[PDB]
Symmetry: D2
Subunit: 455 residues, 4 copies
Amino acid sequence: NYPAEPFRIKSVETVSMIPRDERLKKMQEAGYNTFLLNSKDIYIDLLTDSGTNAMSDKQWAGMMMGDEAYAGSENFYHLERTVQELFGFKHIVPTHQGRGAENLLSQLAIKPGQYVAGNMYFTTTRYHQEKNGAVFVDIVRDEAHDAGLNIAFKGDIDLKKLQKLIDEKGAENIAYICLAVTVNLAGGQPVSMANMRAVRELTAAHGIKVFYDATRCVENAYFIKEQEQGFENKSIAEIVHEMFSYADGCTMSGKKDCLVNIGGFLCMNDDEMFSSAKELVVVYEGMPSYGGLAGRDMEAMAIGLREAMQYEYIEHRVKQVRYLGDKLKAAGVPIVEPVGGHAVFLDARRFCEHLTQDEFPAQSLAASIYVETGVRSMERGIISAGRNNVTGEHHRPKLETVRLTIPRRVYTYAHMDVVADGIIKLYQHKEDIRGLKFIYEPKQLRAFTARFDYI
Amino acid sequence: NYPAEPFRIKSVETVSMIPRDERLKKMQEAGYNTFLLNSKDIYIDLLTDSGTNAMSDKQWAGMMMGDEAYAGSENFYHLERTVQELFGFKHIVPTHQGRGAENLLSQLAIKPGQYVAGNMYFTTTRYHQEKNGAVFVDIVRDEAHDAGLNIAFKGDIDLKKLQKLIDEKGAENIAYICLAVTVNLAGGQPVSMANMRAVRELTAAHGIKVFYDATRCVENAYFIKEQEQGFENKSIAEIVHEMFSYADGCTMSGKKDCLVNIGGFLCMNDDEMFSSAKELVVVYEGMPSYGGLAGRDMEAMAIGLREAMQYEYIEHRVKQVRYLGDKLKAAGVPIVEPVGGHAVFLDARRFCEHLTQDEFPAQSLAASIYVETGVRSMERGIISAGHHRPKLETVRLTIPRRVYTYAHMDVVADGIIKLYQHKEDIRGLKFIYEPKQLRAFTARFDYI
Amino acid sequence: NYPAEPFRIKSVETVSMIPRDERLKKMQEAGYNTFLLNSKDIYIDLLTDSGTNAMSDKQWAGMMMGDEAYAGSENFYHLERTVQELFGFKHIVPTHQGRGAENLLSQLAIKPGQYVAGNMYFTTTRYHQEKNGAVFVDIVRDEAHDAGLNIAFKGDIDLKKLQKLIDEKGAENIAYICLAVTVNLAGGQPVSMANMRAVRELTAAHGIKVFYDATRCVENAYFIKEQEQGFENKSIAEIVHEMFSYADGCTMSGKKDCLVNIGGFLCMNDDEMFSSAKELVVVYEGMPSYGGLAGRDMEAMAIGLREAMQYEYIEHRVKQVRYLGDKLKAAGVPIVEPVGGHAVFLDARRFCEHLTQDEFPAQSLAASIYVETGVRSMERGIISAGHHRPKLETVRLTIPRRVYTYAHMDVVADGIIKLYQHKEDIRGLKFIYEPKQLRAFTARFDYI
Amino acid sequence: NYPAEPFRIKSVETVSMIPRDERLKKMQEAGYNTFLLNSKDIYIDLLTDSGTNAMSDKQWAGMMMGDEAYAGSENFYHLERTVQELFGFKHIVPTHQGRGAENLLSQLAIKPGQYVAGNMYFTTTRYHQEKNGAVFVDIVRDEAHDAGLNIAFKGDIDLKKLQKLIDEKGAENIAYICLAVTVNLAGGQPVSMANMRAVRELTAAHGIKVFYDATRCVENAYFIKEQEQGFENKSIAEIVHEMFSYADGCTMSGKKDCLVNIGGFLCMNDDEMFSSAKELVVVYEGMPSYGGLAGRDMEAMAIGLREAMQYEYIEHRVKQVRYLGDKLKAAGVPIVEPVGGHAVFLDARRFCEHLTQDEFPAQSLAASIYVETGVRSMERGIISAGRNNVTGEHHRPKLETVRLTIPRRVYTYAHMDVVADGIIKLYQHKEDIRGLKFIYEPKQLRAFTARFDYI
Ligand SMILES: [K+]
Ligand SMILES: [K+]
Ligand SMILES: [K+]
Ligand SMILES: [K+]
């Protein structure tokens, strides 16, 4: 039911293995904030799947062949050729990571006063749109806002919401559609191919451009092969290629599904926009021949993008996450459903029902998780939501969760068992989890540097 | 019950994942001999734990700092200090691998006509002893020859057999005692510290030298910490250091428990013997300052030897092997017991209790293992014996260190368990071709 | 007179070595624009010293120890401590490269309508300043605009021009002073410590902030040790530390003097400005704990920054550049003087004193350079200026660090010297295609 | 006249750069024996060209793709295929280095009482022959014994000496001919192709086998292309292939001309001997699929062997040595001539004519060289020659030299200038070089651990 790793371990990373009492000391000096823990003090780090992937022996061989030239690097040509072959786009501009490509796209395809619509948003993506004068509109289907609703392709765009938006505001004032695969805010939920072709059908009639946020497109491709009828016989690469046939371009973070620790790029088919793309990249990232990346990183990303297409790799990747979610749900632990492609979200509101949201249950759960197991997770509740500095009070989101984000090819099933067994043990005594009070709170981005103490 | 890996995966190795029909095609072209399979056609390669380990990021950092000088390399100085600190021997001579150290030891401590006794033997170790005029004598306890007997420290030396050997042959005709930790032939079985301390007591009374075959000494140390009373609070390093205090020297294959892919060394305390060791190393291995090893490999071995001392690494290593054995034993699959530190041995006699030993049950089982799952194993029965009929007819599933996961063990076990349920289908093979010596490597077969 | 490399070659990079007729074929398909040549078709690539350096074995060891965590990475802690120790600034924010730090600084220290003054400018630095509403004002000494004038510390700021700027415009409309070390536009020219100390004296009296463009600060430090009285006994590290004591912060491109292939950072002492710096870095570069850099790159940069402090490394780096200039100057080849720390600038005006500036003498010289020798150089004349007629029409031979030998410089010089003896044959080129902005990168040409 | 390096520096190795007074302190604590110096205390280490080479980026990429399997490694198949393609031999057995292959060859092709003849000898080669019951006979041309004689192909075998040996002793008692390329004892002197075909012509008539000691065959191949008429248009690989067409097998040390830091192999065409070769390799080196080498080393050696065939690489390699010899000879410094392919030999007898050989002039010159420049060289005179323990007195060789052995792709011309300028400066004050007395002398192999003090 769950496949073994379709690879061997080539090299390993040393970890501390400090005891529970030491982990408590480390958590106390970190202010009970997992963001302040030192990497060296962590057994299993589920803070993010961004840039934390394990590369292959082929990629590290490519790392030894870094053509570090300012222009005309062989590594760029290999990256360019790979992206044009697997994604099908005409032009590609490398960036140091995905948000670098998003900064370029927002300045190239947005006129001040226009609208941008897409299946929910991301923190950096929404900023570059809003910073450049756009107004974001969420047009995802309403089911994406139900955490417990176990349905497929929860990240599809509602065609009615898109159709109504075009009528009420006009197509000329619509910059583009930002279709993300997968949808991080709904929990890593996929978008069906049928939804993608419908979006292309509707936008093409009004001359409206479509751009993909393809950072986790391979995970999305696997869900299409597994759960959408008519794609069971098609390979991952074939599905990936067809997805992008319904887009005018894309922004990619290689730090995710390209199986590297740094890198991204920007794709598009329009020649004139690509000409302008090369003008802006020199002032933000670098020359269009390297774009803020060392040659060896372009090589590793080009190799990793080809490795991500292996069906066995992506099946194991998703099912390793599914294994963690299934073990938690089989014990009664409340999670967001369905389990996404890259992370399992613990519902801290139900986990810590004896605590109010003002006592930061997700933050206190994450601190308890690390002390019991050595596992770092991310608070994704009231603390991360921040304040509205105009009113001064907290922001209160519907989701008060703890995110267990699985880097690619870094951990085994036995590591997932360590995570699950500690959380399941925590759940059986969940009444002991204590609330936290702010001791230090910074002015902005409090999730990173704030400190707490038990109540 | 079984601990997770005390490390993260830093980089992975790509594998083929070829289907069953291809694996059968690959096995046919290999002549049904697992030794003839290509590495690229193998999902899980359990042929040996020699040199197949996965190194750490610290070791690969050391690999970038190869001081490749012919003499005075910093990497040699690191290795020398590390061995002198962890093992306690005065002198160390690096060799390209363990059998390189064995060639040196046999030529230095053996007079033609003398005897060498020890807890069973190894192929290259016994060869160099016999090459230099010695006669091997097995003095292991008799229980080590019963595969199913589940007792602790099965590799201990019988002191009565050793005492009788001294009387029947005389101490002067005894070159040395070759004490192996662990005992590979008995299934990876450990030697207790009490047996090591007792053997030193008896040999020292007759001026008999003792040399350890320390290739898997760390696995041995963990068994002492786990099963021998008086060592629960002592660290792996403390136990390893105490082990070697009862020996005049050792031969080490770093490819085993030093967590490297090449390398070994020879340790000793005698100054004159070390002086002669440096004379012999230049004509067989290389300068005593590098001994047939690159500087980066000496660095990797020094770091890996220190990493092996971490309790959690060595506990996980052994329990991953135990996990495979326990899953097979809980399904009724016949194995040699107790499970050793580095391998699980399938009892081909019981597994194929319908084919004669002349039908190559271990060899046919190993070929059948690969086609059903993609797992390479080693025949350890009549074919390896070359002396036609050994008591042990086994198939060895040897686990490299830090290379595979529990999910990989599950693939191995679940495939073998399904195979055992149809053990009547496993048939003997045709012999075909045999070389004069070491027939296991190049023989070829066909189904009947 | 010229010192040997204070290092050994650890690994080499394979090069093509294609003949002259192929190089001509390669140049024709490149449109006679050196920017359009493929790396694989180039023997000696002197296009830039940005990100083309060769790392050491210590740095590559650090590359194997990439702690790739999103927060709390050991590599960040190493980089932070190293910069705080060598530069003396309180806070550091890593960026993927120098212009990344410039984007942060310009948005944090510039009010729309204010002025920024400094010793000449850089393309990305001046852009981000103008992007945020500033107006650039060049306050370098006038001598820096004469290519042939051989004087020391040609990059010093004119204090009179700075004093007049304060009076004519007011200090409140001055965002900060952008002091670059070294000055790339003037030919890699250094700034004396006395000028740095004097500029801080004048700015501090009016509350004017000072920020350094420290991308080549180590080359600058060596010139202070070599040519400024009072610093002969002081170390490179001591000089670097004293340099930054006269600044409120700095932007660093590690791709230059930190001996790495990617990376940069932003330093400052103000706590509130650093607090805002961390808010802006997440939307442009990444978390303040990694800032768009892999952990292994932060490690490489921390090690490389410390390696750059070795006197023998930095002396050899500069004197290898000087060796190229001296060999060309001794043959009569016209260059900008004095030779800078990272590049030799061929004076295309004197080299082609028969072609007009509209015939692209620098661009035609650069294309001619490659076909005769296989050396890529950068046009630094009218085409890069995009503002049609600059005073300097030069060709830049930029030396990566630790990549080439004196024998490589000889190939460059001997080929250029032979070319100069036939400078009448170098002809102008056809313009063909120009993009709206930054025309140097994609223009194409043909011989007349 | 001297070509620049046909490669760029990809990565560098840190060195100490300690001053002259420190180097004197280091030399004193080393007992004035260069063999006892620490590698970290040396700027330019010219002790040997064995295993000290700098690998390429391609090789280090191959190092990341180590297939470490006990049997059937892809790296072995790549090594096997490369050797069969470039050398033309049917069978190959990897060994940890050349002397490992020589141990195998001596036990396979020598019956006790037989003779082995070849163009001079090497220390490890002669031992394995003599240890296995053979009697060595030097059949090199007499010109190889004249140090100052500047002639080409000084390492050719004298056909008369070979013809006379066959008549006086009989072919059945001749094990094989050991033709070494190049000849290390004569100073790295090459063997012509015409000499090789003549040796094959004479031996084949008597059924006498021929085996090459091809450790520096590429350097030998370059001399054939440069100095033997009729080979100016042929490539290095073509010349290498033709050389081995006149041999039944070879022993190779990859640590030399294969541009690696470890490795060797044994080649042959006889099937039955190869069957026996695989039996002996398991007890001395390892399985015939790896032979005492890690998979990554077999890969680096296979890649390096292909790189060694590039004409520009080998031309630069030889001419960098020639540059050092020419600079020394142009200043009057006495050297062995002609300059060999891998090293320059200083004639210490002429350099230190005020010292007798019992005062160890070569050893004292080497110590003075390091203190003045930071350059390690090897004494190749009375100290290395050792004693005859039967009589007790020293051995006294005709050659009292200091060997400056150049590793491949490690140093530049400026490093050669450092070597030459220091030695030339030493020569101008050569009367100051003082003799040394033994303070500690070991029983055997005194060159490695003996210590001295000035007289
Ligand atoms: K990362
Ligand atoms: K191996
Ligand atoms: K670069
Ligand atoms: K070496």
